Design goal:
alpha/beta, Protein-Tyrosine Phosphatase, Chain A, nine-stranded mixed β-sheet, two-stranded antiparallel ribbon, 7 helices, about 30% helix, globular, binds 1-(4-amino-2-hydroxyphenyl)ethan-1-one, enzyme binding, zinc ion binding, EC 3.1.3.48
């Protein structure tokens, strides 16, 4: 079926939970043996969210190459994304090592450091220009260059230096700051505006390594971001845009990381975002 009328048909019939459970039942199951090794317990935020072995990002290190991060490679859309958990106190250096080694231009953050009164990720970037951060375990230096605070999101320019080679690179930090502590946004308008700002920066384009996207577990809000981006790109590429099937795209993405889209409300919100976004594109 088309999307907008499939949408009204699920609303009128109140069957979002049944649609979402079908997706959960059909989703791929692949091994994640490296994630479950005892030496990696303090590298995982949640025991039930792990990268598959076949798609995990490897650190360029011979001691321990593990990070909780996955490469989502969308062949028809010609887009790739790295989805990862919010960094932990003992993985902030690994996080920036990955950004460096994968040649990423942008980092997309969809959570606040504290939500619901608890810490959802480490404070992994500097908050003042004159107070830079050094990650001694991976030999990197990170400096805040500029910060632009808007009503729904903040964009930061960061300098990452590889202290071993003295090479430097400019990284863009795109921080969506207004996702509610509970539920999903009422309108997708600010989320879509944010997606378009990431696109306009070059961070999603083939001349760079894959964008790094995270929330707390790296599957819920993060899944919503890449699902909406890929669906809108396919609607532009195909002769028949009504052929784009958001459930099929989501199941393709779940071949590369488990659990993408965590609730039926996030599924409905993803439909809403693609529907409204397709009108603005034209
Ligand atoms: C030139 C290069 O390798 C490079 C990679 C990533 C980045 N954010 C900036 C850069 O200049
Ligand atoms: C601050 C911001 O929105 C921004 C835009 C374009 C670009 N090439 C780099 C940037 O940091």
């Amino acid at each position: 079926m088309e999307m907008e009328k499939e949408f009204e048909q699920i609303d009128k019939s109140g069957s979002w939970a049944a649609i979402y459970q079908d997706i959960r039942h059909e989703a791929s199951d692949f091994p994640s043996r490296v994630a479950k090794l005892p030496k990696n317990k303090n590298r995982n935020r949640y025991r039930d969210v792990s990268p598959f072995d076949h798609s995990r990002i490897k650190l360029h290190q011979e001691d321990n190459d593990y990070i909780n991060a996955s490469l989502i490679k969308m062949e028809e859309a010609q887009r790739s994304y790295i989805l990862t958990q919010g960094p932990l106190p003992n993985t902030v250096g690994h996080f920036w090592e990955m950004v460096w080694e994968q040649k990423s231009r942008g980092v997309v953050m969809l959570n606040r450091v504290m939500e619901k009164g608890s810490l959802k990720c480490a404070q992994y970037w500097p908050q003042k220009e004159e107070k830079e951060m050094i990650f001694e375990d991976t030999n990197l230096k990170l400096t805040l260059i500029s910060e632009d605070i808007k009503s729904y999101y903040t964009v930061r320019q960061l300098e990452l230096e590889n202290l071993t080679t003295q090479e430097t690179r400019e990284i863009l930090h795109f921080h969506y700051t207004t996702w509610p502590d509970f539920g999903v946004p009422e309108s997708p308008a600010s989320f879509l505006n944010f997606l378009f700002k990431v696109r306009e920066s070059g961070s999603l384009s083939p001349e760079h390594g894959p964008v790094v996207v995270h929330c707390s577990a790296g599957i819920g809000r993060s899944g919503t971001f890449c699902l909406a981006d890929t669906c809108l790109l396919l609607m532009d590429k195909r002769k028949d845009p009504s052929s784009v099937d958001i459930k099929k795209v989501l199941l393709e993405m779940r071949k590369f990381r488990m659990g993408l889209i965590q609730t039926a409300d996030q599924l409905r919100f993803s439909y809403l975002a693609v529907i409204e976004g397709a009108k603005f594109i034209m």
